[PDB]
Amino acid sequence: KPHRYRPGTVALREIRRYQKSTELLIRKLPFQRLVREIAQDFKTDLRFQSSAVMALQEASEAYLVGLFEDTNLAAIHAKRVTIMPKDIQLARRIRGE
Amino acid sequence: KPHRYRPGTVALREIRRYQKSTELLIRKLPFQRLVREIAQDFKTDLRFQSSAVMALQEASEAYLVGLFEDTNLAAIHAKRVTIMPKDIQLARRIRGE
Amino acid sequence: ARAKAKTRSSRAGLQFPVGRVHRLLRKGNYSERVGAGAPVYLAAVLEYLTAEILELAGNAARDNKKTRIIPRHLQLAIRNDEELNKLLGRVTIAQGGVLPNIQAVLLPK
Amino acid sequence: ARAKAKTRSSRAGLQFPVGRVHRLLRKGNYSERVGAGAPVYLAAVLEYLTAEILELAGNAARDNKKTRIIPRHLQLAIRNDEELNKLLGRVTIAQGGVLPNIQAVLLPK
Amino acid sequence: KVLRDNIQGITKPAIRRLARRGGVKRISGLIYEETRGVLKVFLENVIRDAVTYTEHAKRKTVTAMDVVYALKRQGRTLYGFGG
Amino acid sequence: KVLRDNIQGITKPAIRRLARRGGVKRISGLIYEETRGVLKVFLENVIRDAVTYTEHAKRKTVTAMDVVYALKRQGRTLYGFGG
Amino acid sequence: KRSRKESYSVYVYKVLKQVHPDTGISSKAMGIMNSFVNDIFERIAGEASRLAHYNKRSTITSREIQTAVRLLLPGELAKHAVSEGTKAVTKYTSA
Amino acid sequence: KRSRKESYSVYVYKVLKQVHPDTGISSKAMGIMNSFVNDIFERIAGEASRLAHYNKRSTITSREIQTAVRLLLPGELAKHAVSEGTKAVTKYTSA
Amino acid sequence: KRSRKESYSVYVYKVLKQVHPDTGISSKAMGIMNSFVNDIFERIAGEASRLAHYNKRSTITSREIQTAVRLLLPGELAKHAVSEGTKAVTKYTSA
């Protein structure tokens, strides 16, 4: 019988890895593609310095991380361990959005 | 048999009454005693304009009702109607307090 | 033989004082140089903002059968538009109260 | 004919440039006139701030057995100090990550 | 002259009124002292700012405009008492 | 030239990785599209500010210091990009 | 007599009198209006100074405060306020 | 040929060698430090500017800067900064 | 050698530019606008003539023009149009 961990043990393992880690978690080239796509809506023919795109990527990553830990606080507050979208709307609406 | 409202009925009538109203909720003189008590702990013999007290008051009920609106939202997020100290702690932590 | 002293607020056709706001930017320490059209633009945008919020305050007062504005009208005016809420998310109004708002689960069956 | 030029940072015994920060205040449009001791005081305040945060960063790097400071070490320095975190709750550090932080209920048993 | 206990001056019925303004349906008994602590934290956080402005102004009396500054520094700007 | 549907370019496992860094151990499958929407709104706000800054710069190319101006004016200040 | 305290009340009376000739004013609400206009004035002036710094421009003109209004004030009021301000500055351009 | 760009690399480097003779830096960490020092300088200077506004003083002094530091910096960071700045002001006055 | 026929193309083109700098116009749509402005102008002018006739006034004044604006234009269009015309005649009075 091939080896298989129980669920969550693996999850805590990459929790430890990725919370230890420092690098960006999302793929780069779709992030330039997306920022070009959405900046296309406001003004035409925009050119992007790679440093600006990286700074946007880090800001987005930190904003999402803060949102996710707030939803963690909300989820453990509701005596559950699995997050649901109303945690996200709650966290944003308490935050002021 | 004397009339007696079911629990929550007078509470909701209080909700409507105090939410339509704008007049003050904190007795101003014990509050002013608390203000002078905290003030003399930092600098002695401080004197207060009445408007300074008033503003300190308006701001405090503003901050508190912000917390209880957040508390109500997080409490109905928690499938309860009674607020508990962990909820106010949660609201302060989500606000970054 | 000087021409008659006519005013820049009237020159822009506007009610807010162009000269006072210009002076207030000059000694408000935002730059050593300032253009002439900037206080005109600034007076215009504040007049538009006061005009729309005073429209909302007037309708709120008339709906409550009051011919004099109260800060409760101001609070009801600002909070009933979401875009002004994004303008005024962190702003406290004295004696304003809050919107009449009950969570639906709090209501009885 | 002329005295030897002596730097004002050496007069204050500080590493941060008194003259540069003084010039930055003069072109920073904060006041029409600046007192002489205010940039000295500000440079001392900043020098203490950078000194303590660099001490924390060096201690954190020595914990990681690295002789050169890393943005990860900087994030560890900011978030493991409560008082600097209260100073800098709203800041984002590039490539910094977050603290190792697992909620107790998330652990097994 | 000196004061030692005025946190209880924010009475439990007053906190109940505050909760009714916030839309709170049911209030636990443990809420009140916590609200006293949180209110104490906020008022001390703003009044240290206020006393800082008053000592910098070389005044001995606290003015309202300094309190307005003290609230707007934490981004909790209160309208109507400026000027 | 025209790009149409890069919103799903933020893949599901990337969101799982971000939740891992967020400290989430268990993530619902109904999470990802709202997180895409929230990221979407946030990026709209910041790049709208960014293109406003850049259009004031009379430049056709967005630059990094303009982006970090947009973030600090939005209250999410960035370090490490020429600030 | 006491030294002058300059304020923004009477202009609010004039603009309301244009938009609503009939209504009255309470004084603490009038103070709330003064706080509103002073607050928005400080926000726009700070953004104007910041943008004049970033483009290294010595001069506060209408064009960068237009940029600042597009930054701070959102959406519908932003574009309409831009409209009235451009109308006003063109009228002042015609003296 | 390019135009010279201002930095705080040498001062932070001297401070690091003062507190830690044996430690190095990464360039990304130095970028964070430049953003840090510029940010704190902007915060304190703008806060002092509005203090100069509020007392109607057109002159900014180290008293104002001290007020801003006590106002903004939480805890004993403020009083340590006041002590260091006070020592610096005194030994600058003597020199 | 020719004789002019007057039109409203220049004014509608200008006000189109203040309301929308970036939009064009077709000439037949401008003919539609010419018919629109002439038709509304003749309606208001004829109704103004009848109002002047009813109260035996030989002078046409802005008051009955304002009356005719309430008379023809329904509700919202009427109240806002009265507002702009009122503020406009205030500037003309001050001129």
Residue numbers in the entry:
A (entry chain K), B (entry chain O): 37 to 133
C (entry chain M), D (entry chain Q): 10 to 118
E (entry chain P), F (entry chain L): 20 to 102
G (entry chain N), H (entry chain R), I (entry chain H): 30 to 124
Mind quoting what the paper says about this structure?
Here, we report cryo-EM structures of human H1-containing tetranucleosome arrays with four physiologically relevant NRLs. The structures show a zig-zag arrangement of nucleosomes, with nucleosomes 1 and 3 forming a stack. H1 binding to stacked nucleosomes depends on the NRL, whereas H1 always binds to the non-stacked nucleosomes 2 and 4. H1 contacts DNA with L1, the amino-terminal part of α2 together with L3, and α3 to stabilize the nucleosome and contribute to chromatin compaction.
In all structures, nucleosomes 1 and 3 form a canonical stack, whereas nucleosome 2 is located in a DNA loop between the two stacking nucleosomes and is rotated relative to the nucleosome stack. H1 is absent from the stacked nucleosomes of the 4×177 array, but is present on nucleosome 1 in the 4×187 and 4×197 arrays, and is present on both stacked nucleosomes in the 4×207 array. Furthermore, exit DNA of nucleosome 1 shows the highest Δβ value for the 4×177 array, which is the only array in which H1 is lacking on this nucleosome. Altered linker DNA trajectories, as observed in our 4×177 array, sterically preclude H1-linker DNA contacts that are required for stable H1 binding. To confirm that our observations are not a result of low salt concentrations, we solved the trinucleosome core structure of the H1-bound 4×177 array at 60 mM NaCl and confirmed the presence of nucleosome stacks and the absence of H1 on stacking nucleosomes. Stacking of nucleosomes 1 and 3 is apparently stabilized by H1 binding to nucleosome 2, because a published structure of a 3×177 trinucleosome array lacking H1 adopts a non-stacked, extended conformation.
